[PDB]
Each structure stands twice: as structure tokens, then as C-alpha cells.
GROMACS .gro file of C-alpha atoms in nm:
model
  378
    1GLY     CA    1   0.232  -0.679   5.719
    2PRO     CA    2   0.332  -1.000   5.861
    3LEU     CA    3   0.697  -0.992   5.935
    4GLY     CA    4   1.017  -1.179   5.835
    5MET     CA    5   1.090  -1.485   5.903
    6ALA     CA    6   1.397  -1.603   6.089
    7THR     CA    7   1.699  -1.726   5.947
    8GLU     CA    8   1.971  -1.778   6.190
    9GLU     CA    9   1.816  -2.132   6.271
   10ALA     CA   10   1.996  -2.439   6.406
   11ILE     CA   11   1.751  -2.662   6.165
   12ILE     CA   12   1.530  -2.492   5.879
   13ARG     CA   13   1.212  -2.716   5.829
   14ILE     CA   14   1.127  -2.627   5.411
   15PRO     CA   15   0.808  -2.810   5.309
   16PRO     CA   16   0.723  -2.899   4.977
   17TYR     CA   17   0.696  -2.677   4.672
   18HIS     CA   18   0.904  -2.418   4.876
   19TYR     CA   19   1.267  -2.274   4.850
   20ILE     CA   20   1.563  -2.129   5.062
   21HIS     CA   21   1.888  -2.020   4.969
   22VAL     CA   22   2.219  -2.115   5.140
   23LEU     CA   23   2.533  -1.900   5.165
   24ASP     CA   24   2.844  -2.094   5.168
   25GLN     CA   25   3.074  -1.820   5.368
   26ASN     CA   26   3.394  -2.024   5.253
   27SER     CA   27   3.425  -1.986   4.824
   28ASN     CA   28   3.109  -1.791   4.873
   29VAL     CA   29   2.894  -2.068   4.633
   30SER     CA   30   2.544  -1.913   4.677
   31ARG     CA   31   2.297  -2.201   4.614
   32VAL     CA   32   1.938  -2.320   4.713
   33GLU     CA   33   1.779  -2.591   4.922
   34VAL     CA   34   1.462  -2.760   4.819
   35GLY     CA   35   1.146  -2.912   4.997
   36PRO     CA   36   1.021  -3.101   5.145
   37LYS     CA   37   1.304  -3.161   5.350
   38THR     CA   38   1.468  -3.050   5.725
   39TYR     CA   39   1.795  -2.872   5.659
   40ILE     CA   40   2.021  -2.848   5.967
   41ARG     CA   41   2.321  -2.569   5.831
   42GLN     CA   42   2.664  -2.661   5.883
   43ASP     CA   43   2.931  -2.399   6.011
   44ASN     CA   44   3.011  -2.192   5.701
   45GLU     CA   45   2.653  -2.201   5.633
   46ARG     CA   46   2.477  -1.887   5.597
   47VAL     CA   47   2.029  -1.918   5.523
   48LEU     CA   48   1.964  -1.597   5.298
   49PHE     CA   49   1.578  -1.637   5.405
   50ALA     CA   50   1.346  -1.828   5.538
   51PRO     CA   51   1.087  -2.106   5.321
   52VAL     CA   52   0.876  -1.919   5.011
   53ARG     CA   53   0.685  -2.052   4.778
   54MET     CA   54   0.794  -2.204   4.451
   55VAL     CA   55   0.673  -2.005   4.150
   56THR     CA   56   0.399  -2.234   4.025
   57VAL     CA   57   0.265  -2.147   3.642
   58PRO     CA   58  -0.084  -2.291   3.585
   59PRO     CA   59  -0.193  -2.371   3.229
   60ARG     CA   60  -0.250  -2.117   2.996
   61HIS     CA   61  -0.052  -1.815   3.178
   62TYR     CA   62   0.296  -1.705   3.167
   63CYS     CA   63   0.552  -1.554   3.371
   64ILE     CA   64   0.845  -1.341   3.296
   65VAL     CA   65   1.203  -1.479   3.509
   66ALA     CA   66   1.477  -1.219   3.493
   67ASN     CA   67   1.814  -1.317   3.457
   68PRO     CA   68   1.738  -1.698   3.403
   69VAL     CA   69   1.925  -1.993   3.480
   70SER     CA   70   2.148  -2.170   3.195
   71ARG     CA   71   2.014  -2.531   3.162
   72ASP     CA   72   2.210  -2.764   2.937
   73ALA     CA   73   2.083  -2.992   2.632
   74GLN     CA   74   1.909  -3.216   2.907
   75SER     CA   75   1.752  -2.880   3.079
   76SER     CA   76   1.959  -2.923   3.401
   77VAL     CA   77   2.097  -2.642   3.528
   78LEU     CA   78   2.435  -2.560   3.434
   79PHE     CA   79   2.698  -2.474   3.742
   80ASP     CA   80   3.006  -2.241   3.741
   81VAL     CA   81   3.383  -2.420   3.778
   82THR     CA   82   3.290  -2.227   4.144
   83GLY     CA   83   2.949  -2.436   4.200
   84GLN     CA   84   2.723  -2.140   4.124
   85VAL     CA   85   2.460  -2.186   3.906
   86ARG     CA   86   2.525  -1.989   3.620
   87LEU     CA   87   2.260  -1.778   3.467
   88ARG     CA   88   2.190  -1.588   3.186
   89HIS     CA   89   2.276  -1.224   3.287
   90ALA     CA   90   2.090  -0.966   3.141
   91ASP     CA   91   1.785  -1.124   2.936
   92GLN     CA   92   1.452  -1.239   3.002
   93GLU     CA   93   1.274  -1.586   2.967
   94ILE     CA   94   0.940  -1.677   2.942
   95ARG     CA   95   0.775  -1.933   3.148
   96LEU     CA   96   0.449  -2.121   3.021
   97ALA     CA   97   0.267  -2.383   3.220
   98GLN     CA   98   0.541  -2.563   3.429
   99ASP     CA   99   0.622  -2.807   3.740
  100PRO     CA  100   0.677  -2.537   4.039
  101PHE     CA  101   1.000  -2.422   4.021
  102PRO     CA  102   1.251  -2.261   4.298
  103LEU     CA  103   1.453  -1.976   4.188
  104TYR     CA  104   1.808  -1.960   4.163
  105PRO     CA  105   2.022  -1.757   4.316
  106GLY     CA  106   2.085  -1.419   4.101
  107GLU     CA  107   1.771  -1.510   3.912
  108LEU     CA  108   1.448  -1.297   4.004
  109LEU     CA  109   1.056  -1.249   3.881
  110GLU     CA  110   1.050  -0.996   3.668
  111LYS     CA  111   0.665  -1.044   3.557
  112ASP     CA  112   0.417  -1.245   3.811
  113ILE     CA  113   0.190  -1.481   3.735
  114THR     CA  114  -0.023  -1.354   3.350
  115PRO     CA  115  -0.261  -1.492   3.183
  116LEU     CA  116  -0.145  -1.558   2.826
  117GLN     CA  117  -0.314  -1.361   2.552
  118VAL     CA  118  -0.612  -1.522   2.353
  119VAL     CA  119  -0.659  -1.380   2.011
  120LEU     CA  120  -0.970  -1.413   1.915
  121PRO     CA  121  -1.119  -1.469   1.531
  122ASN     CA  122  -1.167  -1.124   1.334
  123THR     CA  123  -0.860  -0.993   1.531
  124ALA     CA  124  -0.523  -0.954   1.579
  125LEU     CA  125  -0.181  -0.888   1.767
  126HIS     CA  126  -0.019  -0.550   1.615
  127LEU     CA  127   0.355  -0.676   1.668
  128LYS     CA  128   0.624  -0.477   1.673
  129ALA     CA  129   1.021  -0.635   1.682
  130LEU     CA  130   1.164  -0.471   1.981
  131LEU     CA  131   1.541  -0.578   1.841
  132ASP     CA  132   1.712  -0.842   1.602
  133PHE     CA  133   1.603  -1.158   1.633
  134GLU     CA  134   1.538  -1.470   1.414
  135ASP     CA  135   1.205  -1.629   1.453
  136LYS     CA  136   1.047  -1.994   1.413
  137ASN     CA  137   1.107  -2.032   1.048
  138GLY     CA  138   1.428  -1.943   1.083
  139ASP     CA  139   1.359  -1.558   0.875
  140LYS     CA  140   1.582  -1.313   1.036
  141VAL     CA  141   1.360  -1.007   1.218
  142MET     CA  142   1.476  -0.682   1.238
  143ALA     CA  143   1.439  -0.442   1.506
  144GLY     CA  144   1.117  -0.156   1.422
  145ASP     CA  145   0.906  -0.433   1.193
  146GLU     CA  146   0.533  -0.473   1.244
  147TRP     CA  147   0.372  -0.776   1.137
  148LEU     CA  148   0.011  -0.918   1.284
  149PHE     CA  149  -0.066  -1.243   1.502
  150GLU     CA  150  -0.441  -1.337   1.358
  151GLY     CA  151  -0.655  -1.514   1.551
  152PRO     CA  152  -0.797  -1.736   1.658
  153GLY     CA  153  -0.511  -1.853   1.877
  154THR     CA  154  -0.333  -1.809   2.192
  155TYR     CA  155  -0.029  -1.590   2.164
  156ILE     CA  156   0.301  -1.660   2.344
  157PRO     CA  157   0.483  -1.387   2.453
  158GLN     CA  158   0.801  -1.288   2.298
  159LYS     CA  159   1.097  -1.119   2.501
  160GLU     CA  160   1.187  -0.951   2.151
  161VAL     CA  161   0.864  -0.838   2.012
  162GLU     CA  162   0.600  -0.618   2.205
  163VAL     CA  163   0.214  -0.578   2.155
  164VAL     CA  164   0.146  -0.245   2.017
  165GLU     CA  165  -0.265  -0.301   1.954
  166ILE     CA  166  -0.514  -0.558   1.963
  167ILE     CA  167  -0.687  -0.463   1.638
  168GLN     CA  168  -1.038  -0.554   1.554
  169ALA     CA  169  -1.218  -0.582   1.226
  170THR     CA  170  -1.436  -0.339   1.059
  171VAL     CA  171  -1.772  -0.440   0.887
  172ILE     CA  172  -1.844  -0.317   0.556
  173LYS     CA  173  -2.247  -0.378   0.488
  174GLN     CA  174  -2.470  -0.421   0.161
  175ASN     CA  175  -2.394  -0.104  -0.007
  176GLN     CA  176  -2.062   0.028   0.163
  177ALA     CA  177  -1.674   0.082   0.113
  178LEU     CA  178  -1.424   0.081   0.375
  179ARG     CA  179  -1.140   0.426   0.302
  180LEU     CA  180  -0.768   0.252   0.335
  181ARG     CA  181  -0.451   0.453   0.337
  182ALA     CA  182  -0.143   0.328   0.336
  183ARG     CA  183   0.121   0.387   0.651
  184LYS     CA  184   0.378   0.270   0.426
  185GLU     CA  185   0.453   0.133   0.084
  186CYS     CA  186   0.246  -0.228   0.101
  187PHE     CA  187   0.072  -0.452  -0.098
  188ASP     CA  188  -0.350  -0.407  -0.155
  189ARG     CA  189  -0.590  -0.729   0.009
  190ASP     CA  190  -0.612  -0.795  -0.370
  191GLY     CA  191  -0.243  -0.798  -0.417
  192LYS     CA  192  -0.233  -0.458  -0.600
  193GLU     CA  193   0.069  -0.201  -0.543
  194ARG     CA  194   0.023   0.110  -0.290
  195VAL     CA  195   0.268   0.354  -0.212
  196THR     CA  196   0.295   0.553   0.092
  197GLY     CA  197  -0.022   0.774   0.183
  198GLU     CA  198  -0.186   0.630  -0.069
  199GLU     CA  199  -0.565   0.550  -0.076
  200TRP     CA  200  -0.860   0.324  -0.172
  201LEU     CA  201  -1.159   0.159  -0.113
  202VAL     CA  202  -1.238  -0.221   0.022
  203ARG     CA  203  -1.590  -0.336  -0.128
  204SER     CA  204  -1.568  -0.695  -0.017
  205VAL     CA  205  -1.906  -0.728   0.211
  206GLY     CA  206  -1.841  -0.823   0.607
  207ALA     CA  207  -1.585  -0.810   0.859
  208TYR     CA  208  -1.225  -0.653   0.747
  209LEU     CA  209  -0.910  -0.725   0.956
  210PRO     CA  210  -0.686  -0.442   0.834
  211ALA     CA  211  -0.304  -0.542   0.749
  212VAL     CA  212  -0.040  -0.406   0.978
  213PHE     CA  213   0.007  -0.053   0.723
  214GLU     CA  214  -0.331  -0.034   0.601
  215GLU     CA  215  -0.486   0.295   0.828
  216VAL     CA  216  -0.886   0.232   0.835
  217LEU     CA  217  -1.019   0.617   0.735
  218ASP     CA  218  -1.402   0.572   0.713
  219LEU     CA  219  -1.686   0.398   0.586
  220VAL     CA  220  -1.834   0.547   0.238
  221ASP     CA  221  -2.199   0.501   0.199
  222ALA     CA  222  -2.316   0.410  -0.176
  223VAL     CA  223  -2.535   0.671  -0.351
  224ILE     CA  224  -2.856   0.533  -0.387
  225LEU     CA  225  -3.029   0.586  -0.745
  226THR     CA  226  -3.310   0.578  -0.949
  227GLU     CA  227  -3.526   0.642  -1.212
  228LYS     CA  228  -3.587   1.040  -1.190
  229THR     CA  229  -3.214   1.069  -1.061
  230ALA     CA  230  -2.867   1.121  -1.196
  231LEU     CA  231  -2.513   1.096  -1.004
  232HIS     CA  232  -2.279   1.395  -1.135
  233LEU     CA  233  -1.883   1.272  -1.050
  234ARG     CA  234  -1.543   1.476  -1.156
  235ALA     CA  235  -1.179   1.259  -1.208
  236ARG     CA  236  -0.940   1.414  -0.948
  237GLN     CA  237  -0.717   1.233  -1.137
  238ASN     CA  238  -0.679   0.974  -1.445
  239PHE     CA  239  -0.818   0.651  -1.316
  240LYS     CA  240  -1.046   0.406  -1.495
  241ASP     CA  241  -1.393   0.313  -1.256
  242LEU     CA  242  -1.559   0.029  -1.147
  243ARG     CA  243  -1.682  -0.079  -1.438
  244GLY     CA  244  -1.399  -0.012  -1.670
  245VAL     CA  245  -1.407   0.347  -1.839
  246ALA     CA  246  -1.108   0.555  -1.848
  247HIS     CA  247  -1.166   0.912  -1.685
  248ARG     CA  248  -0.935   1.170  -1.747
  249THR     CA  249  -0.887   1.431  -1.440
  250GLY     CA  250  -1.111   1.705  -1.466
  251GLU     CA  251  -1.386   1.545  -1.676
  252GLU     CA  252  -1.765   1.509  -1.540
  253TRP     CA  253  -2.008   1.230  -1.598
  254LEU     CA  254  -2.318   1.093  -1.503
  255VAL     CA  255  -2.448   0.750  -1.325
  256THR     CA  256  -2.758   0.649  -1.361
  257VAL     CA  257  -3.009   0.352  -1.252
  258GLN     CA  258  -2.864   0.156  -1.599
  259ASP     CA  259  -2.472   0.187  -1.495
  260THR     CA  260  -2.603   0.056  -1.075
  261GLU     CA  261  -2.843   0.108  -0.873
  262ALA     CA  262  -2.596   0.175  -0.592
  263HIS     CA  263  -2.269   0.391  -0.644
  264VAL     CA  264  -1.992   0.398  -0.357
  265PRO     CA  265  -1.802   0.719  -0.512
  266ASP     CA  266  -1.449   0.622  -0.571
  267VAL     CA  267  -1.150   0.747  -0.407
  268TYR     CA  268  -1.074   0.928  -0.739
  269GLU     CA  269  -1.413   1.008  -0.798
  270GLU     CA  270  -1.569   1.373  -0.639
  271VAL     CA  271  -1.949   1.403  -0.594
  272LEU     CA  272  -2.049   1.734  -0.765
  273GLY     CA  273  -2.417   1.635  -0.717
  274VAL     CA  274  -2.729   1.413  -0.728
  275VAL     CA  275  -2.879   1.564  -1.157
  276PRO     CA  276  -3.281   1.530  -1.161
  277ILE     CA  277  -3.425   1.377  -1.447
  278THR     CA  278  -3.584   1.660  -1.680
  279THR     CA  279  -3.914   1.533  -1.778
  280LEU     CA  280  -4.037   1.640  -2.070
  281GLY     CA  281  -4.449   1.581  -2.134
  282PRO     CA  282  -4.631   1.531  -2.489
  283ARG     CA  283  -4.709   1.936  -2.557
  284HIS     CA  284  -4.361   2.057  -2.421
  285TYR     CA  285  -4.050   2.037  -2.564
  286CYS     CA  286  -3.726   2.244  -2.437
  287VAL     CA  287  -3.379   2.378  -2.623
  288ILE     CA  288  -3.052   2.199  -2.445
  289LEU     CA  289  -2.764   2.551  -2.447
  290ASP     CA  290  -2.412   2.414  -2.555
  291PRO     CA  291  -2.494   2.027  -2.567
  292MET     CA  292  -2.261   1.753  -2.562
  293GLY     CA  293  -2.169   1.605  -2.870
  294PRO     CA  294  -2.021   1.185  -2.938
  295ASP     CA  295  -1.679   1.329  -2.830
  296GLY     CA  296  -1.812   1.380  -2.437
  297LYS     CA  297  -1.737   1.752  -2.514
  298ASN     CA  298  -1.983   2.088  -2.480
  299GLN     CA  299  -2.009   2.237  -2.801
  300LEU     CA  300  -1.983   2.582  -2.648
  301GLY     CA  301  -2.240   2.804  -2.834
  302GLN     CA  302  -2.496   2.549  -3.038
  303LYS     CA  303  -2.849   2.483  -2.916
  304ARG     CA  304  -3.015   2.124  -2.932
  305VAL     CA  305  -3.406   2.129  -2.985
  306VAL     CA  306  -3.574   1.834  -2.747
  307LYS     CA  307  -3.938   1.751  -2.730
  308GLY     CA  308  -4.171   1.592  -2.739
  309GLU     CA  309  -4.261   1.281  -2.453
  310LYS     CA  310  -3.950   1.220  -2.378
  311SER     CA  311  -3.673   1.178  -2.025
  312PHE     CA  312  -3.334   1.259  -1.983
  313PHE     CA  313  -3.077   1.383  -1.780
  314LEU     CA  314  -2.899   1.729  -1.840
  315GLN     CA  315  -2.478   1.631  -1.908
  316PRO     CA  316  -2.270   1.788  -1.735
  317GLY     CA  317  -2.196   2.176  -1.867
  318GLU     CA  318  -2.548   2.158  -2.039
  319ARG     CA  319  -2.810   2.377  -1.979
  320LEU     CA  320  -3.239   2.466  -2.059
  321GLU     CA  321  -3.249   2.777  -2.267
  322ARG     CA  322  -3.618   2.845  -2.120
  323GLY     CA  323  -3.657   2.538  -1.907
  324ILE     CA  324  -3.979   2.306  -2.027
  325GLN     CA  325  -4.126   2.554  -2.263
  326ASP     CA  326  -4.478   2.464  -2.399
  327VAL     CA  327  -4.496   2.341  -2.767
  328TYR     CA  328  -4.720   2.620  -2.996
  329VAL     CA  329  -5.091   2.541  -3.011
  330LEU     CA  330  -5.219   2.681  -3.359
  331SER     CA  331  -5.557   2.707  -3.393
  332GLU     CA  332  -5.698   2.788  -3.740
  333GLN     CA  333  -5.761   3.149  -3.668
  334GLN     CA  334  -5.364   3.166  -3.536
  335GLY     CA  335  -5.064   3.189  -3.678
  336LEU     CA  336  -4.656   3.245  -3.635
  337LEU     CA  337  -4.461   3.449  -3.813
  338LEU     CA  338  -4.085   3.279  -3.817
  339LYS     CA  339  -3.734   3.376  -3.938
  340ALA     CA  340  -3.422   3.192  -4.036
  341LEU     CA  341  -3.121   3.276  -3.827
  342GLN     CA  342  -2.924   3.023  -4.086
  343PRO     CA  343  -3.040   2.828  -4.401
  344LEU     CA  344  -3.303   2.608  -4.395
  345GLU     CA  345  -4.209   2.049  -4.339
  346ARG     CA  346  -4.190   2.396  -4.574
  347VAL     CA  347  -3.945   2.459  -4.837
  348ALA     CA  348  -3.574   2.555  -4.773
  349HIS     CA  349  -3.515   2.884  -4.686
  350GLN     CA  350  -3.253   3.158  -4.666
  351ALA     CA  351  -3.031   3.353  -4.408
  352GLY     CA  352  -3.252   3.628  -4.245
  353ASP     CA  353  -3.609   3.512  -4.449
  354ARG     CA  354  -3.953   3.516  -4.326
  355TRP     CA  355  -4.300   3.329  -4.377
  356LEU     CA  356  -4.608   3.208  -4.199
  357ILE     CA  357  -4.747   2.948  -4.086
  358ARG     CA  358  -5.127   2.883  -3.944
  359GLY     CA  359  -5.261   2.630  -3.776
  360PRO     CA  360  -5.453   2.354  -3.720
  361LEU     CA  361  -5.053   2.244  -3.616
  362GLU     CA  362  -4.901   2.142  -3.341
  363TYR     CA  363  -4.520   2.345  -3.391
  364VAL     CA  364  -4.169   2.373  -3.175
  365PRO     CA  365  -3.931   2.589  -3.344
  366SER     CA  366  -3.631   2.455  -3.489
  367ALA     CA  367  -3.301   2.527  -3.369
  368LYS     CA  368  -3.254   2.804  -3.674
  369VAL     CA  369  -3.577   2.915  -3.681
  370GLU     CA  370  -3.719   3.187  -3.446
  371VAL     CA  371  -4.110   3.330  -3.386
  372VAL     CA  372  -4.065   3.655  -3.449
  373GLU     CA  373  -4.472   3.692  -3.377
  374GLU     CA  374  -4.765   3.535  -3.262
  375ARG     CA  375  -5.059   3.679  -3.476
  376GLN     CA  376  -5.424   3.555  -3.406
  377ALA     CA  377  -5.781   3.595  -3.577
  378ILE     CA  378  -5.651   3.546  -3.900
   0.00000   0.00000   0.00000
């Protein structure tokens, strides 16, 4: 517990770095008496308390004093016409490392000795304006405003500003990108305009310290492409990709390893899958159903014959009619009865004409012809 010291003494010895308050019962002027001194009380006087330690604020620490004393240009305490030390009632004052000081009548220690907040590199304090004030540049700050104190540094606490959170940076590895969403309207890290709720990717490798209105969402891994795989994407809206090619909402395309070995799907690219390479050997062929033309549009109803030792990826909307078909290997005794489905080795044929072909021949049918029969022992 420790009992309360006596105040009604003829003598009070005030040691170094201690103080008492004495009330003058005439005039009612309450004042501080500071050590070291042997204070002798007078008839009119009344000691408000026995000696208490002065507040000592050490280096790199602070405290907050409520109802702090008003001071003149030269930092001397100001008094009323009555002689009472005049205070700035109801506001606060941050006190940094300093000569041990007493508390004058009325003023009180609103926050005891606290270390100053050290902000490390790649970290930042998220600071909020509690009310209106002019900062050290002379810029008018408004209540509710938000900004960052980026380290390294030692943040001096401000009565007008609260620390909402310490912000740590997010690390982005080689084949990664960080997805962000704008809390409010703001400018990008690259300087690009961003509306509220809009999302974009940060591709910069390393530690990324986000801006005050950048909401950090998720890291996105790149899809690692190979010789035998392709990434099948779809545009969520109109956008120009990282390579600089225009994509319109709903359009689909393939990213190969020729474009990039690692592709991070951007915010407006929807991944539909990874396409395996169609590998056709020397005696293999296939028929692409609804092949994609030069315009980048599926030719609904058309067919394309692909043959020989060739490899390719099926484009969006393409199909194989009958998979990797074996090429017809016709020996001498073998033969094929063909038919034209439309006009046309050999001479030109008409609509539904039919003719025979013998071996030795390595044969793949045209898109316009069909194999009607496979005769043998001719």
C-alpha cells in the first residue's frame, strides 16, 4: 500500500527533483514549490501534498500531459492576473526527452513514460486524422484523412493523429504477382488511375509496401508453361494484355511458351485450363472440326485436315473429328473407293463422283472426299 505522507507540517524538506503544491488560502492562488529546498509553511499557506517525484522523460521516450501549462515565446510558464499558472485546459501536449519537470497545478500526467514508436524499413504506420489540423509543411489536414509514415524513422506521436495499424510489406517472389483492391479512388504504384473496388496486379519482385488505400488481397502464382502445354484464357472484359494485344470480353486464346514460359493470369484474364499439345507422327493425321481462320473466329461447320510429323495446340472452340487418325497405308493389292462430297494427284472430279485408288501409296483423304470402301486383294 504505502501510506500517504503528512502535509500539515511546519517544515517540508523537498528533495532534488521533487515538488509540492502549496495553496495560498487568501487569493486561492495554488502554486508549485520545487526542490531542493527546506520549505517552511506560512500562516495563509496549505500544502496540497508531500513531495512527489518530477516526471523524467528519458531519450527516445515520450509522455502526454493533460491541461498543459501555457508558455511564452521563451518557454517560461505564463500566469493569470491572480498569479495562478494558466493552463491550456482540455488539450494535450507530447513531452519528449527533457529536463526532469514538475506538474504545475491543474496539469496532470495523461499518459506516463512511453517509448517512441520506431518504424522499421519496409514498414509504415497507418495514420488517421482524429480532427482538423495544419501539419509541419503548412498543409491543412482534415478529420478522417489517412496517410502512411514510411520507415525507417522514429514516429513522434501527435495529439491530432491516431495509429490505426502498423503495415508490413508483402514479399513477391520471381513468378508471382500481388492482387490489390482500391479502398477509395487513388493512384497506382506506377501512377495509373484506379476507381474504388478496382483490382490490379503488382508484378514487381521483392517486398511491396502497400499504399494507404491499397487493400492487399492474394499472391498469384504464374502458370509454368512447357513445349507440350498451353494456357487457355478468356477475357472477362475489354483489356490489353501485358504483351500489348487487345482482347475483347468473351474472346479466348492460348498462351504458349513462345509468348512466355511463366504467365501470371491478370485480373481480367479467366483461366479455362491448360491445353495439351496435339502431337501427330509421320503416319498420323487428324481433322480439325470448326477450325479457327485468320480473323480469330471459329469457322462453324468447316473442316481442316492436318497431317505429317507436326505438332500443334487445339485453339479455343476447335475439336478433332476422330482423334489422331492413322494415315491409310495402301499396299499394291489394297485399294480405296473414294467419293467427292464437293467438286475438285488425280484429275478434277465433280459433285458425287466416285473413283478408285491403288497402292503402293500413303494416303490421307481430303476435306472434300470421303473413303466409301477399303477394298483388298485387287
